[PDB]
């Protein structure tokens, strides 16, 4: 199965620099072109960079949006593309995403970017990391609950309920900015005969301050 | 530099319908020599990676539906969905690769269903934020279309503006729909100083308010 992890995304300070990691597997690594992708929260993919394979010399190509500014390399005895990003600025805040590119040199050769990672965030901005306060949300046939997930800094954070395993009937809205401390809400829907009968409890993250929260809805 | 171009920006659809969305490079993307067309679309639906649907302009990835279908050659090309299904709600992009490679910048697909009312939650400050000296009240609104929709909140029978974030998700990929939160946020000190905390939701399926409301002495 091919596999493609990014890590190494986060905050960082305007003119800052940072190196961005894409861990690879499932697949014979030296053979094939790599790029990186990006994508400003609501807007299009922008191709970055990529490096070509062992035939090819390991050569790269940029954007001219990040040449002289981005650097994309690869080692080959661990699997790994990176991408080491400087004089950071704002409109670099988005997810980067690594994907497998070509290899031009199989007979099952066909031009496209074919996997996909998960992406990795940064965010370009002189503002604070700060945790999220989580809270429950309890009312006052089916009942709804959720958590509020509020003020922190930079974005993203995850939220699941039941650890994963409550997944239909959720909703998680998208976060909102406000006076730079971000807000975001989940809400969860269930039978009542399973509430609050059965435990119902959202789990939250913040990578950036490695926070990890579990709130148990509790009816009050 | 190859310029791409998608049209339309966006559309809605609703199931079972055809769908039909544009892309141009500003050069051609023909190597007559191989007679490939280095261009290929995408789909990226809500919160998740871009996923390749077709490449070559025509060619499916294996697995890909064969209701999807990818034309044209040279600058023009077209990505058709026939019989459109609700877990198609995505942001297509097309893609060359011709001169290194360069992304369109997307046409988003939305679905058309019948109207549905929202249903609406409201759910006072927790302790646990009290303790603290801040007062949030949370309106979720479920379920609903149009997404066309509006919020007031209202204290002790007066409309509060003042401190109130929305967010709306995206649309529901099973049922169409789609849902909003809404937000008050008071000082503790505000809070305790008014007892009807009321949101009134505003949505074309009704003629008069969809109202939910607690006081804060029960
Ligand atoms: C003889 C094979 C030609 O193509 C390859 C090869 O099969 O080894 C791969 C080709 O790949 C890349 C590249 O830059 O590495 C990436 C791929 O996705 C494409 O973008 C191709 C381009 O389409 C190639 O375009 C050019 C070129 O730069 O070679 C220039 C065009 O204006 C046109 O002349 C085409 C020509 O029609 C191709 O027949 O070539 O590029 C690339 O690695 C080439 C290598 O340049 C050949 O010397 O090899
Ligand atoms: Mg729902
Ligand atoms: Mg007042
Ligand atoms: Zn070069």
């Known amino acids: 199965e091919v596999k493609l992890v990014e890590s190494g995304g986060g905050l960082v300070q305007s003119g800052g620099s940072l190196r961005l990691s894409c861990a690879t597997s499932?697949?014979?690594?030296?053979?094939?072109?790599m790029s990186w992708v990006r994508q400003p929260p609501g807007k299009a993919l922008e191709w970055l960079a990529f490096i070509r394979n062992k035939a090819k010399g390991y050569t790269t190509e940029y954007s001219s949006s990040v040449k002289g500014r981005f650097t994309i390399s690869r080692d080959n005895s661990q699997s790994f593309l990176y991408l080491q990003m400087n004089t950071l600025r704002a409109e670099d805040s988005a997810t980067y995403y690594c994907?497998?590119?070509?290899?031009?040199?199989?007979?099952?050769?066909?031009?496209?970017?074919?996997?996909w990672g998960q992406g990795t965030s940064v965010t370009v901005s002189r503002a604070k990391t700060t945790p999220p306060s989580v809270y429950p949300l309890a009312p006052g046939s089916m009942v709804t609950l959720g958590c509020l997930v509020k003020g922190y800094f930079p974005e993203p954070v995850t939220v699941t309920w039941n650890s994963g395993s409550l997944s239909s009937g959720v909703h998680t809205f998208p976060a909102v900015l406000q006076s730079d401390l971000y807000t975001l809400s989940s809400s969860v829907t269930v039978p009542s005969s399973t509430w609050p009968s059965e435990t119902v409890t959202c789990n939250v993250a913040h990578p950036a301050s490695s926070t990890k929260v579990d709130k148990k809805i509790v009816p009050r | 530099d190859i310029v791409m171009t998608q049209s339309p920006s966006s559309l809605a659809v609703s199931a079972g319908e055809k769908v039909t969305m544009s892309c141009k490079s500003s050069?051609?993307?023909?190597?007559?020599?191989?007679?490939?067309?280095?261009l290929a679309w995408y789909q990226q639906k809500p919160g998740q990676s871009p996923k390749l649907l077709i490449y070559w302009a025509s060619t499916r990835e294996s697995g890909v539906p064969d209701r999807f279908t990818g034309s044209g050659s040279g600058t023009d090309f077209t990505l058709t969905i026939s019989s459109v299904q609700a877990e198609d709600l995505a942001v297509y992009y097309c893609?060359?690769?011709?001169?290194?490679?360069?992304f369109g910048g997307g046409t988003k697909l939305e679905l058309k269903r019948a109207d549905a009312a929202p249903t609406v939650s409201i759910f006072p400050p927790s302790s646990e934020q009290l303790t603290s000296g801040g007062a949030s009240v949370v309106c979720f609104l479920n379920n609903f279309y149009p997404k066309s929709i509006a919020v007031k909140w209202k204290i002790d029978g007066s409309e509060r503006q003042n401190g109130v974030l929305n967010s709306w998700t995206d649309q529901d990929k099973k049922d169409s729909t789609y849902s909003m939160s809404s937000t008050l946020t008071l000082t503790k000190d505000e809070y305790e100083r008014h007892n009807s905390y009321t949101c009134e939701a505003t949505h074309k399926t009704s003629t008069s308010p969809i109202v939910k409301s607690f006081n804060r002495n029960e």
């Open positions: 893609k060359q690769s011709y001169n290194l490679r360069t």
């Open positions: 499932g697949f014979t690594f030296t053979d094939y072109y």
């Open positions: 994907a497998r590119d070509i290899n031009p040199g199989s007979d099952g050769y066909y031009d496209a970017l074919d996997y």
């Open positions: 050069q051609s993307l023909l190597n007559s020599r191989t007679r490939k067309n280095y």
